[PDB]
Amino acid sequence: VKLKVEDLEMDKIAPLAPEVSLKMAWNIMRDKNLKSIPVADGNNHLLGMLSTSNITATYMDIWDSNILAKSATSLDNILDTLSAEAQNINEERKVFPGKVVVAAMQAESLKEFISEGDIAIAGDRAEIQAELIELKVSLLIVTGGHTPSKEIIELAKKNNITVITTPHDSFTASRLIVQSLPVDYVMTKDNLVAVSTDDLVEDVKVTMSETRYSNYPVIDENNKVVGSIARFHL
Amino acid sequence: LKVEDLEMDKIAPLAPEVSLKMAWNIMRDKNLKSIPVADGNNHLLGMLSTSNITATYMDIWDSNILAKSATSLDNILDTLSAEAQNINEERKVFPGKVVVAAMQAESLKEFISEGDIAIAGDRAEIQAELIELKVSLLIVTGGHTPSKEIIELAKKNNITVITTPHDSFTASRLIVQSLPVDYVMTKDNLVAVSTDDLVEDVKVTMSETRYSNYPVIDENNKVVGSIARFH
Numbered sequence: 001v002k003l004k005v006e007d008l009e010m011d012k013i014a015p016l017a018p019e020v021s022l023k024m025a026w027n028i029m030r031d032k033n034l035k036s037i038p039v040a041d042g043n044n045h046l047l048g049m050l051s052t053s054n055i056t057a058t059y060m061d062i063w064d065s066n067i068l069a070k071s072a073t074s075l076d077n078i079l080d081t082l083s084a085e086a087q088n089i090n091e092e093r094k095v096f097p098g099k100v101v102v103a104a105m106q107a108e109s110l111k112e113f114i115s116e117g118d119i120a121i122a123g124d125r126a127e128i129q130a131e132l133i134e135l136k137v138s139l140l141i142v143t144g145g146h147t148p149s150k151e152i153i154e155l156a157k158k159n160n161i162t163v164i165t166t167p168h169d170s171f172t173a174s175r176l177i178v179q180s181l182p183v184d185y186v187m188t189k190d191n192l193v194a195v196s197t198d199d200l201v202e203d204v205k206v207t208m209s210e211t212r213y214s215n216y217p218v219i220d221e222n223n224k225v226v227g228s229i230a231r232f233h234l
Numbered sequence: 235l236k237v238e239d240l241e242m243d244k245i246a247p248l249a250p251e252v253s254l255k256m257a258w259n260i261m262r263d264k265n266l267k268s269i270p271v272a273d274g275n276n277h278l279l280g281m282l283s284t285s286n287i288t289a290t291y292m293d294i295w296d297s298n299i300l301a302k303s304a305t306s307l308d309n310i311l312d313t314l315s316a317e318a319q320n321i322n323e324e325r326k327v328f329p330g331k332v333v334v335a336a337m338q339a340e341s342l343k344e345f346i347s348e349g350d351i352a353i354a355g356d357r358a359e360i361q362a363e364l365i366e367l368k369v370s371l372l373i374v375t376g377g378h379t380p381s382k383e384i385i386e387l388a389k390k391n392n393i394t395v396i397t398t399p400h401d402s403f404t405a406s407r408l409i410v411q412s413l414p415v416d417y418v419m420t421k422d423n424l425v426a427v428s429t430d431d432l433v434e435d436v437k438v439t440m441s442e443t444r445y446s447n448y449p450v451i452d453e454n455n456k457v458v459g460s461i462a463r464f465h
């Protein structure tokens with residue numbers, strides 16, 4: 001009998017969940033030396049492929065802010081990525097709709113640069129933080145590990161502004177934050193070339209030579225993601 | 235069947251001083267998982283993967299990174315779409331850390347030290363104090379070219395000063411794309427293949443590793459391209 005895909009020895013790795021961050025994804029991938037990994041849903045049906053090339057394009061190619069918006073990046077992803085902790089959470093805002101801005105300026109001229117719904121990265125100055133609150137940023141990120149005073153926190157409570165503290169400095173926090181993005185915003189979703197447990201190895205061969213992908217997700221006869229295969233397993 | 239017989243990617247190798255940005259553009263546009271790096275005589279120096287680029291962006295705490303890597307100013311200018319208003323022509327290296335000068339005048343001394351790379355806005359006072367602190371590189375944001383006065387101060391004190399159209403957040407994201415490929419690429423245990431090898435023998439070689447591509451050399455040890463399992 002000719003060989004089928006299940007007859008091979010492949011990478012039986014658990015697919016990623018679509019809500020996990022680029023950062024969580026890269027750690028999982030790097031630690032298995034994977035060039036790409038499947039994404040699946042709660043029922044373990046194929047949603048996507050995620051390549052290191054996708055991650056990289058996301059860093060190397062961005063004019064676009066509201067990126068946090070378009071990706072619907074969640075607060076948990078930002079806290080994890082910035083090793084941060086929340087002092088107040090607007091529990092009814094799931095999306096941060098504006099752009100990321102380093103509040104470099106002094107208090108009076110912040111309005112020329114920072115709008116309602118923006119994500120502002122500020123330092124340990126109460127004056128700055130109060131003005132960012134009055135401007136109704138969707139998220140205040142305070143740097144240097146300098147947890148804000150109770151007065152500022154109560155003002156965020158009053159106005160329902162999400163406020164968090166990271167130990168990182170503004171530069172570092174600016175480099176990190178894009179690692180927060182969920183995989184599902186970055187992964188490939190269309191024209192997925194998948195392979196069945198029961199396809200003949202000789203058929204898969206043909207199929208694989210048609211494209212140049214590092215890996216192909218393997219799906220069982222019940223349509224569930226079982227792992228992935230590469231040219232190397234042939 | 236000889237390796238040369240086969241059909242391959244005939245891609246020109248990267249020069250080792252090229253930035254990650256420029257390198258990614260060439261790869262992205264030729265759809266390359268990896269690419270050879272070679273010297274000015276076309277002898278093999280290394281292999282550069284997108285994994286090596288990504289790892290550089292994800293896993294980095296290490297400032298002085300600009301220093302460790304001898305990142306050049308032309309690389310920073312390109313990446314930041316910047317213009318130089320003064321240049322210290324006797325300094326190839328920027329040795330300190332990158333710091334966003336978000337702070338106020340009198341407080342800068344606590345966070346910024348001599349040799350640092352300061353990202354600043356359109357404030358003469360701040361720019362002047364940064365100069366007085368002897369930063370290696372003052373980067374000015376928002377397309378806000380510094381005043382003649384600030385320019386002459388940089389002149390007398392030999393401080394490199396440049397202006398980028400980008401804001402501080404974006405400058406901070408971009409700057410790391412400046413590093414030269416040779417700081418990032420794999421250098422050792424390079425697995426290469428001769429134009430004049432048995433295709434059956436490159437098959438055994440290849441199965442012992444999981445690399446996307448293997449660079450191809452002729453019998454003069456010149457890099458002619460690369461091949462993959464695909465081929």
Ligand SMILES: Nc1ncnc2c1ncn2[C@@H]1O[C@H](COP(=O)(O)O)[C@@H](O)[C@H]1O
Pocket residue numbers: 035036049050051052053054187188190191192193194212213214215216217267
């Ligand atoms: N098996 C696949 N089917 C369809 N698209 C893929 C597959 N694997 C990767 N991709 C996508 O195709 C591009 C190149 O993938 P890769 O070869 O894995 O670097 C990236 O956008 C991937 O997300």
Ligand SMILES: Nc1ncnc2c1ncn2[C@@H]1O[C@H](COP(=O)(O)O)[C@@H](O)[C@H]1O
Pocket residue numbers: 035267268281282283284285286419420422423424425426444445446447448449
């Ligand atoms: N042909 C090769 N020989 C030796 N090392 C390589 C080769 N290609 C890539 N590498 C390195 O091995 C690691 C994985 O590369 P890749 O499989 O191309 O993502 C990266 O650090 C590469 O720089």
